[PDB]
């Protein structure tokens, strides 16, 4: 929201560039970062988990 | 001069019978000049219904809030004055923003493996809820069952939250068909509460 959270920003950058996520999945995680910045670290882990699970078959 | 600010209990904000309150706590105060003055603000407008508990050897201030104001995302802020400290210290708290989502409540019976034991575990899975503010209780035939523990909410895959609640009961009570029920309280629930029962087939 208003103030600079380093983990929120870093999480946002990574999720933006995760190669295996769809558009809707990407928007969902980024929306969670906006709504709930205090759990940015856990949101990123869930995003990476989904990204790796959807790695090119 | 540390300044901490806590939200009301999830149950207090949801149940009209209960009284929700925001709490402004402080430690490391000057024994030199240990008076301290709180000035509260709701959405940027000053209120005066706050009460300061007697000091301790910790000075805490309690502001009572309207259930609906907290649930509608109003901002609360206490200004802490003190002559033995530079300028005042402002801190703000609010309910977590974001689209609320309804919890899914599932009761799970004890594993067949646990039946060898004297006491068995009654499990309640609560998932898919947002924000994380939630309350959980157990009861049996009207009366409260207090021998339970509920994990804090944990972030799930889809950004929502989940938790588990474990009620421990004597195997005897479970095996003679006693009815147990878990009640969950969340803003995205109808009437802010629901209950699910669990019993032997």
Curated annotation (Swiss-Prot), chain A:
Important immunodiagnostic reagent because of its ability to bind the Fab and Fc fragments of a wide range of mammalian immunoglobulins. Immunoglobulin-binding region C repeats lie at residues 1-57. It is found in: Secreted, Cell wall. Belongs to the immunoglobulin-binding protein SpA family. Each of the immunoglobulin-binding region repeats can bind the Fc region of an immunoglobulin. Plays a role in the inhibition of the host innate and adaptive immune responses. Possesses five immunoglobulin-binding domains that capture both the fragment crystallizable region (Fc region) and the Fab region (part of Ig that identifies antigen) of immunoglobulins. In turn, Staphylococcus aureus is protected from phagocytic killing via inhibition of Ig Fc region. In addition, the host elicited B-cell response is prevented due to a decrease of antibody-secreting cell proliferation that enter the bone marrow, thereby decreasing long-term antibody production. This is Immunoglobulin G-binding protein A. The lineage of its organism: Bacteria, Bacillati, Bacillota, Bacilli, Bacillales. The gene is spa. The chain holds residues 271 to 327 of 508 of the full protein.
Curated annotation (Swiss-Prot), chain B:
Changing residue 57 to Q: In variant WIS. Changing residue 96 to A: In variant OMM. Residues 98-201 are annotated as: CH3. Disulfide bonds join 24-78, 124-182. Residues 1-97 are annotated as: CH2. Residues 1-94, 103-199 form the Ig-like domain. Glycans are attached at residue 149. N-linked glycans at Asn-149 are noncore fucosylated and the vast majority are diantennary species with a bisecting GlcNAc. Among them the most dominant glycans are HexNAc5Hex4, HexNAc5Hex5, and HexNAc5Hex5Sia1. Coiled coil: none annotated. Constant region of immunoglobulin heavy chains. Immunoglobulins, also known as antibodies, are membrane-bound or secreted glycoproteins produced by B lymphocytes. In the recognition phase of humoral immunity, the membrane-bound immunoglobulins serve as receptors which, upon binding of a specific antigen, trigger the clonal expansion and differentiation of B lymphocytes into immunoglobulins-secreting plasma cells. Secreted immunoglobulins mediate the effector phase of humoral immunity, which results in the elimination of bound antigens. Immunoglobulins are composed of two identical heavy chains and two identical light chains; disulfide-linked. This is Immunoglobulin heavy constant gamma 3. The gene is IGHG3.
């Amino acid at each position: 929201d208003n103030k600079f959270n380093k983990e929120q920003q870093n999480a946002f950058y990574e999720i933006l560039h995760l190669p295996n996520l769809t558009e809707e999945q990407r928007n969902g995680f980024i929306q969670s970062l906006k709504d709930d910045p205090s759990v940015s670290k856990e949101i990123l882990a869930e995003a990476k988990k989904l990204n790796d699970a959807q790695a090119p078959k | 001069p540390s300044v901490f600010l806590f939200p009301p209990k999830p149950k207090d904000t949801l149940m009209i019978s209960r009284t929700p309150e925001v709490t402004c706590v402080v430690v490391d105060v000057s024994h030199e000049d240990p008076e301290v003055q709180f000035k509260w603000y709701v959405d940027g407008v000053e209120v005066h219904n706050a009460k300061t508990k007697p000091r301790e050897e910790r000075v805490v201030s309690v502001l009572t809030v309207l259930h609906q104001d907290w649930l509608n995302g109003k901002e609360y802020k206490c200004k802490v004055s003190n002559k033995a400290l530079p300028a005042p210290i402002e801190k703000t708290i609010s309910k977590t923003k974001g689209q609320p989502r309804e919890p899914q409540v599932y009761t799970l019976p004890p594993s067949r493996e646990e039946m060898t034991k004297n006491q068995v575990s009654l499990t309640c899975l609560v998932k898919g809820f947002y924000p994380s503010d939630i309350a959980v209780e157990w009861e049996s035939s009207g009366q409260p069952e207090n021998n339970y523990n509920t994990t804090p909410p944990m972030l799930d895959s889809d950004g929502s939250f989940f938790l588990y609640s474990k009620l421990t009961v004597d195997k005897s009570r479970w095996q003679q068909g006693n009815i147990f029920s878990c009640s969950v309280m969340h803003e995205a629930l109808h009437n802010h509460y629901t209950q699910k029962s669990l019993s032997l087939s």
